[PDB]
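User: quick one - fold this with chloride ion bound?
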Amino acid sequence: DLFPGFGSEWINTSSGRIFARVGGDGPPLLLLHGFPQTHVMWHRVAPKLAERFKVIVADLPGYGWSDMPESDEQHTPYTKRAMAKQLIEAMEQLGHVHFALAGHDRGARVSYRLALDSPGRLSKLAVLDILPTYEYWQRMNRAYALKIYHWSFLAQPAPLPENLLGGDPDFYVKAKLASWTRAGDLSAFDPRAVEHYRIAFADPMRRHVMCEDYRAGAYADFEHDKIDVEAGNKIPVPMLALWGASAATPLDVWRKWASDVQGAPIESGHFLPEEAPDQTAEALVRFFS
Amino acid sequence: LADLFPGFGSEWINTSSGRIFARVGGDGPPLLLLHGFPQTHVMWHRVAPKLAERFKVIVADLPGYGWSDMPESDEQHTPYTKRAMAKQLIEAMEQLGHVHFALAGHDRGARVSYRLALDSPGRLSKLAVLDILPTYEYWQRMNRAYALKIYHWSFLAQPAPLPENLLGGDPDFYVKAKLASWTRAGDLSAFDPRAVEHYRIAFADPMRRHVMCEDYRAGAYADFEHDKIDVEAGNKIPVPMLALWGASGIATPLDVWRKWASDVQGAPIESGHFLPEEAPDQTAEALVRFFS
Ligand SMILES: [Cl-]
Ligand SMILES: [Cl-]
Ligand SMILES: [Cl-]
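Assistant: Sure. Structure tokens for the protein plus chloride ion:
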């Protein structure tokens, strides 16, 4: 238990339960993790946020201890549009129809898709260390193909990645965690947190969900994004983009997708809330207050 | 493992970079045949007998592949770059007394072949490249559609030991799925099962898999840089050239090779990627006519 003073809830939805740690009081704030992690990646910043907010730390649909909806040929329940609908249902179970939202990695993709589809749900939005899925794929030249190979590899038709990942999943997940930190090793993480990530990744069913998520990320999610950029749609919700310091700035890019956005680099690799918990917490608290 | 070249001799040829295994048959003008990934010299077994009626045919395992030695690699993947492989095979051919010869390559072996022609054109009378575009052209094309369709160029090029460790759990599944994936029908039916077993046994050796990853790492880095120098100088291969590709293989490929070669002809064949196994009579005929 990495969340002192937080409850544990499975929240019912039409697509399956969402697991969350729930703590604090005040305005509601939902925190969404990404790959290859779970809700526990927020354990270092959740307490400072809970000083001021009611904090709901949720496992994404099919991740962690959340239920795994059956997928289909277009990967629908693991599209960011579907994940956002499911988390909107979960927040309604708690009586939250207007809330603050911060996401990281895949959870940040859920979050900006939520803001594009249903802006009235959000008071404020923070996205951590991402650009829109459309922008990634538009940037996908030799240098990007090499640097972020896993967007194409994990999106290969089943069972190719599932088969490869089964041989030594501990090694793959630990290498991903290490490779995207400033330090290049696991020293930025709490070993208890790494064990949560390892345990989740050890399950073949959980890994299949992850591949479905990246398949959606290459196909429907991209198409959904393309419709908005073609329509000139921008997020109206007050928005914060944080990114790890370790091409146009991320702020230059999000200003093209959002009409009220501020942003800043954090001295950190990808995993801002774990590598740079103090700076990340401070920036979020200032933003959401 | 089957002998798929009835009556061909066998040689290990010493070079400064390690031994090259070859099957050798026929008589006449010398013709070197180079395989690619994830195969070995035996992929030429359905066309080599026909070629051997007209040529002295040398069917070699690439450096580090099949039964050729595996040089230790380095931080720039040097021995598995196509420039280094071409230098090594030039040495091997010199050991046989061939300093000017005909060359046909497929897949990685075709990349060795056009690099050989760019670096050392005087070594070649004529050259054929099967189902490839230049490495520079593949990476230039890179966008979302190609990243998704041809993922393995970026996957196998990731820093060791990532692809090595992913390939280790079930290597048979991966090599068979690749072989099947690039044929016209998408299954293994085009291959002789005895040839598949050669490919499988090679891929079952972690040292051989590491070489393959080093080949793709070179393919992403030094090989691409070597190509980039030539295209930005407008260097074109002067050696008479044939480009043969499968209609369900690459991707107009002739238009691409006309930018890289000043005397090139080409044709498609109805086939997936593996032209000499999927379309042996047509491939043999095209080669015999071109080299004759
Ligand atoms: Cl992401
Ligand atoms: Cl190739
Ligand atoms: Cl190609």
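One thing worth noting: Strands of chain B lie at 9-13, 20-26, 30-34, 56-60, 101-106, 124-130, 241-246, 264-269.
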